[PDB]
Amino acid sequence: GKNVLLLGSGFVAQPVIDTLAANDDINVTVACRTLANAQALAKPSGSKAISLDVTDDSALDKVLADNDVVISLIPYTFHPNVVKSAIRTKTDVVTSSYISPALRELEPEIVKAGITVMNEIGLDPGIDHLYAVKTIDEVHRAGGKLKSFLSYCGGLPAPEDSDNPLGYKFSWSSRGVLLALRNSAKYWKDGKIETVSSEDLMATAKPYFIYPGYAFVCYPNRDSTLFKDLYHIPEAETVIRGTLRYQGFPEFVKALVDMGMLKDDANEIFSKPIAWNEALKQYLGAKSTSKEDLIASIDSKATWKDDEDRERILSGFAWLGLFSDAKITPRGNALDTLCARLEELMQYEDNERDMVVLQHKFGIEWADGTTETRTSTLVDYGKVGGYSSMAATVGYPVAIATKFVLDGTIKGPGLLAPYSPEINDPIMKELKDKYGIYLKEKTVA
Amino acid sequence: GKNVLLLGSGFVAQPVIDTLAANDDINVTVACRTLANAQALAKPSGSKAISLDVTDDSALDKVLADNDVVISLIPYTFHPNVVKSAIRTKTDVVTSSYISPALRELEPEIVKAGITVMNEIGLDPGIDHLYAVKTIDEVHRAGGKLKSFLSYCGGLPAPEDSDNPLGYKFSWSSRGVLLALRNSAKYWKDGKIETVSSEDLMATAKPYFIYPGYAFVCYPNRDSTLFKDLYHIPEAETVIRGTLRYQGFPEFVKALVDMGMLKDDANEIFSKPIAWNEALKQYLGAKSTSKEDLIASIDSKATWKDDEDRERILSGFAWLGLFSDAKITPRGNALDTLCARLEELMQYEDNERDMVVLQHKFGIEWADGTTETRTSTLVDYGKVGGYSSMAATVGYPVAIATKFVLDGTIKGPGLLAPYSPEINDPIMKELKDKYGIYLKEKTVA
């Protein structure tokens, strides 16, 4: 049959290996730095397993040449190494990553080599593009105008598993999640560009209604303007892509900001494993380590929405052990010390489920001047003793695309991405049919 | 072994029959009006099945006498018939219902007869009492004062299945759900009684935070004052029991109220199967049946929270087909005609899940004057191709109590209810151990 090489040892690797190895005519080889990882990832399906250093050009060529396609699920800074090897060996490539400037530089050689490098085909990017392109194509074909494109996505605990101060669980690092509300954002609104500064992003966070059961808030991503050219919606007045969190998340982060706790400046208060209450005493200039004095210094620095929120946030600080004798992870700055504690206390437990939510909302003006709003909505949950939704919604599109590269449903050569119905339709159909994963499409009544 | 009679043909009956019949030493007989129902309810477990008219004293005695205990899962107005028969036959009884004045009248004969009639042991009442008594008993035993008791419960769609205008699904009638926001309410707050009139209940509805993931609102039930004597918390300043719904539910109902749609007065506009848009035209005095004119008459009658809510509610009316040519169920009044449409459009589908949420929150003042807040929280979901949470959370406590009546863990005789640790502890322990059902107990940090 066909020989598939998978590079990676993330949780995303497991469903890809498992769904592909289940096919009798596909032989999977798992490659990680350490043979044991790969043997472990490969063990459930009895796949071949090897060790591999991707920076070793010769080692990398040897194994790519033994295969028909390589799935690169390693950090995106390594894709160029993989692709350089694929050019040399004439091997096809599949990634879930945004096309990088390094890959664009290789693009003429990819074409000359006659290989297919399929990109941007997990969840985000991937599934989002499939369904955005689908509707916009339908709207344009019917002579319609896409006046508004809104798109919001989050990976969150299932609501029943959300009871922590952020309504958020880490797998595994928290630094990016935390700093996200201190980024700038640029998007289209009502026929003009709006930009929000780092300082001002926090205040933009607002409830975002999807279904009655959920309490989502949203904030815009760094740059939504790229989707105008990407989806060819020059006529759109409003184009905003953002992130979903649960209620309370921005207010919690804001309080931490006001306390200086997202500052990454080297600061000796965080140099050594002292008690959290002593660290905060020194950092906030509190009278003492007593909960009462710590709260006084927080109160003097924080702007609270109301007493209920103040009570909630301070209780969350208490839950985190910030007012306690628990010893800090000595990371040498406020931010990383905070992140270490968040990470330690807010991981998934074995009977807990994650969730992916993604909704596109389209405001359409038809030729006759009539307007309508459509939604395309995905809610997906992890399976206890199975795969997380975060793993499955990346891994399954990747597996489907790999099979389509192998059998020529996805026709190259070239540096391809899910930007047209011709590539997109077969993937959407197979994703729904095989895995039950699809976006519910509704017109707002 | 032991012989158990089950009266009932509700969805609650299935898990009770099934969990009890799985026991080798329990022989279940299912009794409904029609042999086929009972044979169907009994079929999965191969239980005995009979037909039975509960108003026929002789038929009822015959079968009770053949059994060691009867589980009465039929309407509460029939329990007296069952209990009169149990007195005659000396058979024990288990119900999930609040003790009625009719049962209290029989109480001295129950005692003289030497039978045990166990009551109020499903979810609400049942599980709620187990855990409320538990904490209050713990607080009192440690010399503490229960200053505040808050308790909120709802049966709702899982959030992923909540996408309808009410965030609510019917199984099967909607009339009570709808009129609930037009009831009065009486409770304790800050050391005084507060009462809310029928008209004013709507305005009391407010967000109620349990976990970040969920968007709950709550309103108080008809009478919370009874829990002071029931749980013996004379020292409580605040005692409020209420119902949980999802965000948007009260505002939707309020709009319908403003339109006169919850009026049950005989009204010929609803006498015959005309189109919804024609019915509303006549009822609202709209210019025409056009969506535009219907909305105009709604706008002229309704107070909207904001444009987003107005848009949401009107869209929901559209979804319901109220602006459409769909023919009304001719119920002869506005309310029942509305309820028929709600019921028709908002039932569970086969791959959908329900949810039960119940939280007690206790504000405690300890002897030393220190205060703390505790929560006890249950979130439980239905199983696709299995039992709903609404069925399981009533049926399992009933099954456990029945086994305890049979084996004398619950010691009678008498008209008993789950009001003390002696009765309550064994049930809570078995509910957790056998079914994984328990309330998570936390101190607010």
Side-chain angles (χ1 to χ4, degrees):
Chain A
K2 295 291 193 161
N3 295 135
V4 166
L5 177 68
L6 185 138
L7 310 186
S9 70
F11 257 121
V12 184
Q14 202 76 63
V16 181
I17 299 152
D18 300 343
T19 193
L20 289 176
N23 190 318
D24 283 354
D25 299 330
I26 298 172
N27 312 115
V28 178
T29 303
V30 188
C32 322
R33 322 220 329 209
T34 328
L35 181 58
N37 297 357
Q39 280 180 344
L41 281 173
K43 187 185 177 185
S45 64
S47 281
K48 182 182 297 188
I50 68 169
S51 50
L52 176 73
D53 179 5
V54 306
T55 56
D56 181 337
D57 290 17
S58 314
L60 193 53
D61 285 10
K62 190 160 193 176
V63 58
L64 263 71
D66 284 336
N67 281 279
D68 300 310
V69 64
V70 52
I71 300 174
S72 189
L73 293 175
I74 55 178
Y76 86 90
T77 66
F78 296 114
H79 293 150
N81 297 71
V82 177
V83 167
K84 288 170 184 197
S85 180
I87 284 160
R88 292 191 297 270
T89 58
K90 313 298 203 62
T91 305
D92 298 329
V93 182
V94 178
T95 87
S96 69
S97 294
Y98 267 118
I99 293 167
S100 82
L103 284 199
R104 271 183 217 105
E105 276 159 30
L106 297 167
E107 187 175 8
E109 297 164 76
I110 289 168
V111 180
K112 274 194 80 70
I115 72 173
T116 302
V117 177
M118 178 64 195
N119 309 266
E120 293 182 20
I121 192 50
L123 167 66
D124 169 29
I127 291 174
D128 57 355
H129 291 146
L130 298 173
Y131 282 87
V133 167
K134 177 180 192 285
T135 294
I136 291 162
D137 174 64
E138 284 169 18
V139 170
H140 286 162
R141 273 160 50 239
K145 298 184 169 167
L146 212 301
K147 291 293 185 164
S148 179
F149 179 65
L150 294 179
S151 186
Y152 289 95
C153 185
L156 297 166
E160 68 273 17
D161 299 321
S162 73
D163 189 26
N164 70 34
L166 283 175
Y168 196 90
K169 304 222 170 191
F170 302 103
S171 59
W172 303 101
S173 82
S174 64
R175 196 186 194 273
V177 166
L178 222 48
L179 292 178
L181 280 167
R182 298 287 289 174
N183 278 350
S184 65
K186 174 177 51 166
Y187 50 90
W188 284 95
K189 180 94 177 90
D190 300 335
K192 285 167 169 70
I193 281 181
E194 296 195 353
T195 47
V196 178
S197 66
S198 276
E199 299 83 25
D200 289 344
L201 186 58
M202 180 59 74
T204 76
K206 69 183 193 303
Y208 189 78
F209 182 85
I210 294 178
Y211 297 167
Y214 297 109
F216 294 127
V217 297
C218 70
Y219 58 89
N221 292 343
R222 278 187 321 270
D223 170 52
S224 299
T225 61
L226 301 183
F227 295 107
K228 268 206 158 159
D229 288 347
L230 203 64
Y231 296 151
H232 206 88
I233 51 165
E235 76 283 13
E237 287 169 3
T238 296
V239 185
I240 316 173
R241 177 180 94 124
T243 295
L244 298 163
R245 296 286 174 259
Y246 289 136
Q247 66 191 324
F249 177 103
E251 294 91 324
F252 198 81
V253 179
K254 180 189 167 33
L256 289 169
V257 168
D258 295 342
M259 297 167 56
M261 289 304 299
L262 276 65
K263 297 179 159 58
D264 73 343
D265 305 66
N267 187 331
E268 54 81 24
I269 288 155
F270 303 94
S271 62
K272 300 183 290 312
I274 66 173
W276 261 107
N277 58 15
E278 179 68 39
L280 277 194
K281 178 203 180 277
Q282 296 178 27
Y283 195 52
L284 305 179
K287 283 171 183 185
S288 80
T289 54
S290 72
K291 177 196 273 212
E292 175 174 14
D293 290 336
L294 294 178
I295 292 177
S297 33
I298 292 167
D299 280 339
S300 84
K301 290 178 177 67
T303 316
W304 306 115
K305 278 198 178 162
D306 53 55
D307 295 350
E308 172 185 348
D309 228 40
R310 174 182 177 280
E311 186 170 1
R312 173 187 56 88
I313 290 164
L314 295 177
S315 172
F317 293 168
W319 182 97
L320 278 170
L322 309 193
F323 302 145
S324 80
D325 185 64
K327 305 310 180 287
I328 66 159
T329 298
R331 304 290 294 194
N333 66 270
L335 177 60
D336 292 339
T337 304
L338 172 60
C339 292
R341 184 71 175 176
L342 296 174
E343 301 163 22
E344 177 180 358
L345 266 39
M346 300 163 61
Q347 286 169 36
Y348 283 100
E349 311 289 56
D350 282 336
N351 48 352
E352 294 178 346
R353 289 194 308 174
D354 82 322
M355 184 186 80
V356 165
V357 44
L358 160 63
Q359 187 184 74
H360 291 140
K361 184 195 284 162
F362 312 86
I364 298 156
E365 190 182 296
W366 296 114
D368 55 38
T370 191
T371 57
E372 87 176 68
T373 297
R374 294 183 177 180
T375 60
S376 305
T377 315
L378 168 71
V379 177
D380 187 64
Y381 290 98
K383 291 163 174 59
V384 170
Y387 313 118
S388 73
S389 175
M390 79 186 90
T393 57
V394 180
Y396 293 154
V398 163
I400 290 166
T402 303
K403 286 173 58 175
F404 288 163
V405 169
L406 285 172
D407 78 6
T409 299
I410 286 172
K411 177 147 175 277
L415 181 72
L416 305 181
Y419 294 165
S420 72
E422 170 75 9
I423 278 194
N424 295 357
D425 287 343
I427 299 177
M428 285 187 287
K429 179 176 175 190
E430 179 68 0
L431 193 64
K432 195 181 186 186
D433 287 3
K434 188 171 174 59
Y435 305 105
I437 292 163
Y438 71 104
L439 271 69
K440 290 192 191 173
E441 294 171 281
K442 314 255 182 80
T443 297
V444 176
Chain B
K2 295 291 193 161
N3 295 135
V4 166
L5 177 68
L6 185 138
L7 310 186
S9 70
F11 257 121
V12 184
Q14 202 76 63
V16 181
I17 299 152
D18 300 343
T19 193
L20 289 176
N23 190 318
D24 283 354
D25 299 330
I26 298 172
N27 312 115
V28 178
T29 303
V30 188
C32 322
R33 322 220 329 209
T34 328
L35 181 58
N37 297 357
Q39 280 180 344
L41 281 173
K43 187 185 177 185
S45 64
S47 281
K48 182 182 297 188
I50 68 169
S51 50
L52 176 73
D53 179 5
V54 306
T55 56
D56 181 337
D57 290 17
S58 314
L60 193 53
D61 285 10
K62 190 160 193 176
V63 58
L64 263 71
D66 284 336
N67 281 279
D68 300 310
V69 64
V70 52
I71 300 174
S72 189
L73 293 175
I74 55 178
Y76 86 90
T77 66
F78 296 114
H79 293 150
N81 297 71
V82 177
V83 167
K84 288 170 184 197
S85 180
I87 284 160
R88 292 191 297 270
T89 58
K90 313 298 203 62
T91 305
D92 298 329
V93 182
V94 178
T95 87
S96 69
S97 294
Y98 267 118
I99 293 167
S100 82
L103 284 199
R104 271 183 217 105
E105 276 159 30
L106 297 167
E107 187 175 8
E109 297 164 76
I110 289 168
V111 180
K112 274 194 80 70
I115 72 173
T116 302
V117 177
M118 178 64 195
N119 309 266
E120 293 182 20
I121 192 50
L123 167 66
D124 169 29
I127 291 174
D128 57 355
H129 291 146
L130 298 173
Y131 282 87
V133 167
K134 177 180 192 285
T135 294
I136 291 162
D137 174 64
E138 284 169 18
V139 170
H140 286 162
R141 273 160 50 239
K145 298 184 169 167
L146 212 301
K147 291 293 185 164
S148 179
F149 179 65
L150 294 179
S151 186
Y152 289 95
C153 185
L156 297 166
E160 68 273 17
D161 299 321
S162 73
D163 189 26
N164 70 34
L166 283 175
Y168 196 90
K169 304 222 170 191
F170 302 103
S171 59
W172 303 101
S173 82
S174 64
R175 196 186 194 273
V177 166
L178 222 48
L179 292 178
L181 280 167
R182 298 287 289 174
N183 278 350
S184 65
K186 174 177 51 166
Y187 50 90
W188 284 95
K189 180 94 177 90
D190 300 335
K192 285 167 169 70
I193 281 181
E194 296 195 353
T195 47
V196 178
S197 66
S198 276
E199 299 83 25
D200 289 344
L201 186 58
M202 180 59 74
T204 76
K206 69 183 193 303
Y208 189 78
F209 182 85
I210 294 178
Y211 297 167
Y214 297 109
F216 294 127
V217 297
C218 70
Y219 58 89
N221 292 343
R222 278 187 321 270
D223 170 52
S224 299
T225 61
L226 301 183
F227 295 107
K228 268 206 158 159
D229 288 347
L230 203 64
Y231 296 151
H232 206 88
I233 51 165
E235 76 283 13
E237 287 169 3
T238 296
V239 185
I240 316 173
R241 177 180 94 124
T243 295
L244 298 163
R245 296 286 174 259
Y246 289 136
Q247 66 191 324
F249 177 103
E251 294 91 324
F252 198 81
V253 179
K254 180 189 167 33
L256 289 169
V257 168
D258 295 342
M259 297 167 56
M261 289 304 299
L262 276 65
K263 297 179 159 58
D264 73 343
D265 305 66
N267 187 331
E268 54 81 24
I269 288 155
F270 303 94
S271 62
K272 300 183 290 312
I274 66 173
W276 261 107
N277 58 15
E278 179 68 39
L280 277 194
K281 178 203 180 277
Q282 296 178 27
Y283 195 52
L284 305 179
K287 283 171 183 185
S288 80
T289 54
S290 72
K291 177 196 273 212
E292 175 174 14
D293 290 336
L294 294 178
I295 292 177
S297 33
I298 292 167
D299 280 339
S300 84
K301 290 178 177 67
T303 316
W304 306 115
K305 278 198 178 162
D306 53 55
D307 295 350
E308 172 185 348
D309 228 40
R310 174 182 177 280
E311 186 170 1
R312 173 187 56 88
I313 290 164
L314 295 177
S315 172
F317 293 168
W319 182 97
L320 278 170
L322 309 193
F323 302 145
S324 80
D325 185 64
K327 305 310 180 287
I328 66 159
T329 298
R331 304 290 294 194
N333 66 270
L335 177 60
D336 292 339
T337 304
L338 172 60
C339 292
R341 184 71 175 176
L342 296 174
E343 301 163 22
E344 177 180 358
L345 266 39
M346 300 163 61
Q347 286 169 36
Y348 283 100
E349 311 289 56
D350 282 336
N351 48 352
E352 294 178 346
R353 289 194 308 174
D354 82 322
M355 184 186 80
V356 165
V357 44
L358 160 63
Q359 187 184 74
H360 291 140
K361 184 195 284 162
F362 312 86
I364 298 156
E365 190 182 296
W366 296 114
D368 55 38
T370 191
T371 57
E372 87 176 68
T373 297
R374 294 183 177 180
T375 60
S376 305
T377 315
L378 168 71
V379 177
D380 187 64
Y381 290 98
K383 291 163 174 59
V384 170
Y387 313 118
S388 73
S389 175
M390 79 186 90
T393 57
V394 180
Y396 293 154
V398 163
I400 290 166
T402 303
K403 286 173 58 175
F404 288 163
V405 169
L406 285 172
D407 78 6
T409 299
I410 286 172
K411 177 147 175 277
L415 181 72
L416 305 181
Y419 294 165
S420 72
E422 170 75 9
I423 278 194
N424 295 357
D425 287 343
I427 299 177
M428 285 187 287
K429 179 176 175 190
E430 179 68 0
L431 193 64
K432 195 181 186 186
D433 287 3
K434 188 171 174 59
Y435 305 105
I437 292 163
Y438 71 104
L439 271 69
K440 290 192 191 173
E441 294 171 281
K442 314 255 182 80
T443 297
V444 176

PDB file of all heavy atoms in Angstrom, chain A residues 353-370:
ATOM      1  N   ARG A 353     -13.449  16.901  29.918  1.00  0.00           N
ATOM      2  CA  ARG A 353     -13.572  17.045  28.463  1.00  0.00           C
ATOM      3  C   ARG A 353     -13.222  18.463  28.047  1.00  0.00           C
ATOM      4  O   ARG A 353     -13.610  19.434  28.717  1.00  0.00           O
ATOM      5  CB  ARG A 353     -15.035  16.847  28.019  1.00  0.00           C
ATOM      6  CG  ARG A 353     -15.605  15.442  28.102  1.00  0.00           C
ATOM      7  CD  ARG A 353     -16.920  15.357  27.310  1.00  0.00           C
ATOM      8  NE  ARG A 353     -17.895  16.385  27.676  1.00  0.00           N
ATOM      9  CZ  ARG A 353     -19.057  16.592  27.046  1.00  0.00           C
ATOM     10  NH1 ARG A 353     -19.406  15.830  25.995  1.00  0.00           N
ATOM     11  NH2 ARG A 353     -19.862  17.569  27.459  1.00  0.00           N
ATOM     12  N   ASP A 354     -12.538  18.580  26.900  1.00  0.00           N
ATOM     13  CA  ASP A 354     -12.353  19.873  26.286  1.00  0.00           C
ATOM     14  C   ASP A 354     -13.460  20.113  25.255  1.00  0.00           C
ATOM     15  O   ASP A 354     -14.338  19.246  25.036  1.00  0.00           O
ATOM     16  CB  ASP A 354     -10.928  19.984  25.661  1.00  0.00           C
ATOM     17  CG  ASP A 354     -10.831  19.335  24.282  1.00  0.00           C
ATOM     18  OD1 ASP A 354     -11.452  18.281  24.073  1.00  0.00           O
ATOM     19  OD2 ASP A 354     -10.087  19.874  23.435  1.00  0.00           O
ATOM     20  N   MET A 355     -13.427  21.296  24.645  1.00  0.00           N
ATOM     21  CA  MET A 355     -14.442  21.682  23.665  1.00  0.00           C
ATOM     22  C   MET A 355     -13.811  22.637  22.657  1.00  0.00           C
ATOM     23  O   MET A 355     -12.952  23.451  23.019  1.00  0.00           O
ATOM     24  CB  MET A 355     -15.631  22.364  24.382  1.00  0.00           C
ATOM     25  CG  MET A 355     -16.799  22.729  23.461  1.00  0.00           C
ATOM     26  SD  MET A 355     -18.027  23.665  24.413  1.00  0.00           S
ATOM     27  CE  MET A 355     -17.341  25.320  24.437  1.00  0.00           C
ATOM     28  N   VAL A 356     -14.213  22.489  21.390  1.00  0.00           N
ATOM     29  CA  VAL A 356     -13.907  23.450  20.342  1.00  0.00           C
ATOM     30  C   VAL A 356     -15.231  24.042  19.897  1.00  0.00           C
ATOM     31  O   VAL A 356     -16.203  23.315  19.644  1.00  0.00           O
ATOM     32  CB  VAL A 356     -13.197  22.760  19.167  1.00  0.00           C
ATOM     33  CG1 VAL A 356     -13.195  23.636  17.916  1.00  0.00           C
ATOM     34  CG2 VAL A 356     -11.759  22.386  19.596  1.00  0.00           C
ATOM     35  N   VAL A 357     -15.258  25.367  19.827  1.00  0.00           N
ATOM     36  CA  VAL A 357     -16.400  26.113  19.264  1.00  0.00           C
ATOM     37  C   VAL A 357     -15.895  27.044  18.158  1.00  0.00           C
ATOM     38  O   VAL A 357     -14.951  27.819  18.336  1.00  0.00           O
ATOM     39  CB  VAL A 357     -17.196  26.890  20.382  1.00  0.00           C
ATOM     40  CG1 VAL A 357     -16.234  27.627  21.390  1.00  0.00           C
ATOM     41  CG2 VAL A 357     -18.317  27.805  19.774  1.00  0.00           C
ATOM     42  N   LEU A 358     -16.559  27.001  17.013  1.00  0.00           N
ATOM     43  CA  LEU A 358     -16.170  27.845  15.905  1.00  0.00           C
ATOM     44  C   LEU A 358     -17.467  28.263  15.250  1.00  0.00           C
ATOM     45  O   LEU A 358     -18.311  27.420  14.940  1.00  0.00           O
ATOM     46  CB  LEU A 358     -15.299  27.045  14.909  1.00  0.00           C
ATOM     47  CG  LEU A 358     -15.176  27.597  13.471  1.00  0.00           C
ATOM     48  CD1 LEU A 358     -14.479  28.999  13.482  1.00  0.00           C
ATOM     49  CD2 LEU A 358     -14.431  26.568  12.588  1.00  0.00           C
ATOM     50  N   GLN A 359     -17.641  29.563  15.085  1.00  0.00           N
ATOM     51  CA  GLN A 359     -18.796  30.064  14.333  1.00  0.00           C
ATOM     52  C   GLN A 359     -18.413  31.131  13.352  1.00  0.00           C
ATOM     53  O   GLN A 359     -17.765  32.105  13.752  1.00  0.00           O
ATOM     54  CB  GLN A 359     -19.859  30.644  15.262  1.00  0.00           C
ATOM     55  CG  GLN A 359     -21.164  31.019  14.460  1.00  0.00           C
ATOM     56  CD  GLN A 359     -22.253  31.696  15.315  1.00  0.00           C
ATOM     57  OE1 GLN A 359     -22.148  32.873  15.690  1.00  0.00           O
ATOM     58  NE2 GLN A 359     -23.297  30.952  15.605  1.00  0.00           N
ATOM     59  N   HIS A 360     -18.830  30.973  12.086  1.00  0.00           N
ATOM     60  CA  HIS A 360     -18.772  32.048  11.118  1.00  0.00           C
ATOM     61  C   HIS A 360     -20.164  32.677  11.059  1.00  0.00           C
ATOM     62  O   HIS A 360     -21.159  31.966  11.078  1.00  0.00           O
ATOM     63  CB  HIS A 360     -18.469  31.542   9.721  1.00  0.00           C
ATOM     64  CG  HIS A 360     -17.090  31.008   9.561  1.00  0.00           C
ATOM     65  ND1 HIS A 360     -16.796  29.882   8.820  1.00  0.00           N
ATOM     66  CD2 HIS A 360     -15.916  31.457  10.057  1.00  0.00           C
ATOM     67  CE1 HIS A 360     -15.486  29.680   8.845  1.00  0.00           C
ATOM     68  NE2 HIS A 360     -14.936  30.625   9.584  1.00  0.00           N
ATOM     69  N   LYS A 361     -20.214  33.999  11.004  1.00  0.00           N
ATOM     70  CA  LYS A 361     -21.478  34.666  10.749  1.00  0.00           C
ATOM     71  C   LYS A 361     -21.361  35.627   9.568  1.00  0.00           C
ATOM     72  O   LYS A 361     -20.518  36.551   9.564  1.00  0.00           O
ATOM     73  CB  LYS A 361     -21.923  35.380  12.006  1.00  0.00           C
ATOM     74  CG  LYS A 361     -23.308  36.047  11.903  1.00  0.00           C
ATOM     75  CD  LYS A 361     -23.505  37.017  13.037  1.00  0.00           C
ATOM     76  CE  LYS A 361     -23.802  36.350  14.330  1.00  0.00           C
ATOM     77  NZ  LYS A 361     -23.553  37.313  15.480  1.00  0.00           N
ATOM     78  N   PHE A 362     -22.245  35.434   8.586  1.00  0.00           N
ATOM     79  CA  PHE A 362     -22.166  36.187   7.331  1.00  0.00           C
ATOM     80  C   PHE A 362     -23.378  37.088   7.154  1.00  0.00           C
ATOM     81  O   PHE A 362     -24.508  36.584   7.124  1.00  0.00           O
ATOM     82  CB  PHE A 362     -22.150  35.247   6.140  1.00  0.00           C
ATOM     83  CG  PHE A 362     -21.176  34.096   6.255  1.00  0.00           C
ATOM     84  CD1 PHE A 362     -21.545  32.907   6.902  1.00  0.00           C
ATOM     85  CD2 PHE A 362     -19.920  34.167   5.661  1.00  0.00           C
ATOM     86  CE1 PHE A 362     -20.666  31.826   6.962  1.00  0.00           C
ATOM     87  CE2 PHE A 362     -19.024  33.066   5.722  1.00  0.00           C
ATOM     88  CZ  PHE A 362     -19.389  31.916   6.386  1.00  0.00           C
ATOM     89  N   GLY A 363     -23.122  38.391   6.996  1.00  0.00           N
ATOM     90  CA  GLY A 363     -24.149  39.353   6.599  1.00  0.00           C
ATOM     91  C   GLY A 363     -24.098  39.569   5.092  1.00  0.00           C
ATOM     92  O   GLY A 363     -23.094  40.057   4.554  1.00  0.00           O
ATOM     93  N   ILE A 364     -25.198  39.201   4.425  1.00  0.00           N
ATOM     94  CA  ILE A 364     -25.301  39.163   2.980  1.00  0.00           C
ATOM     95  C   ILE A 364     -26.297  40.214   2.478  1.00  0.00           C
ATOM     96  O   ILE A 364     -27.368  40.402   3.065  1.00  0.00           O
ATOM     97  CB  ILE A 364     -25.763  37.782   2.525  1.00  0.00           C
ATOM     98  CG1 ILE A 364     -24.734  36.719   2.930  1.00  0.00           C
ATOM     99  CG2 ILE A 364     -26.029  37.732   0.993  1.00  0.00           C
ATOM    100  CD1 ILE A 364     -25.347  35.320   3.048  1.00  0.00           C
ATOM    101  N   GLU A 365     -25.918  40.906   1.405  1.00  0.00           N
ATOM    102  CA  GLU A 365     -26.864  41.703   0.632  1.00  0.00           C
ATOM    103  C   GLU A 365     -27.014  41.118  -0.780  1.00  0.00           C
ATOM    104  O   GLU A 365     -26.055  41.048  -1.566  1.00  0.00           O
ATOM    105  CB  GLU A 365     -26.460  43.164   0.608  1.00  0.00           C
ATOM    106  CG  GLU A 365     -27.534  44.058   0.030  1.00  0.00           C
ATOM    107  CD  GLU A 365     -27.092  45.490  -0.015  1.00  0.00           C
ATOM    108  OE1 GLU A 365     -26.864  46.094   1.052  1.00  0.00           O
ATOM    109  OE2 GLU A 365     -26.957  46.009  -1.130  1.00  0.00           O
ATOM    110  N   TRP A 366     -28.217  40.650  -1.079  1.00  0.00           N
ATOM    111  CA  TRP A 366     -28.483  40.023  -2.375  1.00  0.00           C
ATOM    112  C   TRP A 366     -28.632  41.096  -3.457  1.00  0.00           C
ATOM    113  O   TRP A 366     -28.796  42.281  -3.138  1.00  0.00           O
ATOM    114  CB  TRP A 366     -29.740  39.146  -2.307  1.00  0.00           C
ATOM    115  CG  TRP A 366     -29.605  37.990  -1.372  1.00  0.00           C
ATOM    116  CD1 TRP A 366     -30.301  37.786  -0.213  1.00  0.00           C
ATOM    117  CD2 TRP A 366     -28.696  36.880  -1.496  1.00  0.00           C
ATOM    118  NE1 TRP A 366     -29.899  36.610   0.381  1.00  0.00           N
ATOM    119  CE2 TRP A 366     -28.914  36.038  -0.379  1.00  0.00           C
ATOM    120  CE3 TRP A 366     -27.719  36.521  -2.440  1.00  0.00           C
ATOM    121  CZ2 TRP A 366     -28.198  34.857  -0.179  1.00  0.00           C
ATOM    122  CZ3 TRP A 366     -27.005  35.344  -2.241  1.00  0.00           C
ATOM    123  CH2 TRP A 366     -27.250  34.525  -1.115  1.00  0.00           C
ATOM    124  N   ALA A 367     -28.553  40.670  -4.724  1.00  0.00           N
ATOM    125  CA  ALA A 367     -28.692  41.578  -5.880  1.00  0.00           C
ATOM    126  C   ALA A 367     -29.932  42.475  -5.799  1.00  0.00           C
ATOM    127  O   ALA A 367     -29.848  43.692  -6.029  1.00  0.00           O
ATOM    128  CB  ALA A 367     -28.709  40.784  -7.170  1.00  0.00           C
ATOM    129  N   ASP A 368     -31.074  41.878  -5.456  1.00  0.00           N
ATOM    130  CA  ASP A 368     -32.341  42.613  -5.316  1.00  0.00           C
ATOM    131  C   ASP A 368     -32.356  43.578  -4.130  1.00  0.00           C
ATOM    132  O   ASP A 368     -33.346  44.275  -3.907  1.00  0.00           O
ATOM    133  CB  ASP A 368     -33.500  41.622  -5.177  1.00  0.00           C
ATOM    134  CG  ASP A 368     -33.287  40.638  -4.031  1.00  0.00           C
ATOM    135  OD1 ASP A 368     -32.755  41.061  -2.983  1.00  0.00           O
ATOM    136  OD2 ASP A 368     -33.629  39.442  -4.182  1.00  0.00           O
ATOM    137  N   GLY A 369     -31.281  43.597  -3.345  1.00  0.00           N
ATOM    138  CA  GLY A 369     -31.206  44.485  -2.188  1.00  0.00           C
ATOM    139  C   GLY A 369     -31.702  43.880  -0.880  1.00  0.00           C
ATOM    140  O   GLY A 369     -31.610  44.519   0.177  1.00  0.00           O
ATOM    141  N   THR A 370     -32.233  42.657  -0.937  1.00  0.00           N
ATOM    142  CA  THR A 370     -32.636  41.970   0.296  1.00  0.00           C
ATOM    143  C   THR A 370     -31.405  41.459   1.079  1.00  0.00           C
ATOM    144  O   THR A 370     -30.392  41.063   0.482  1.00  0.00           O
ATOM    145  CB  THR A 370     -33.722  40.866   0.074  1.00  0.00           C
ATOM    146  OG1 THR A 370     -34.233  40.448   1.347  1.00  0.00           O
ATOM    147  CG2 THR A 370     -33.176  39.653  -0.647  1.00  0.00           C
TER     148      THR A 370
END
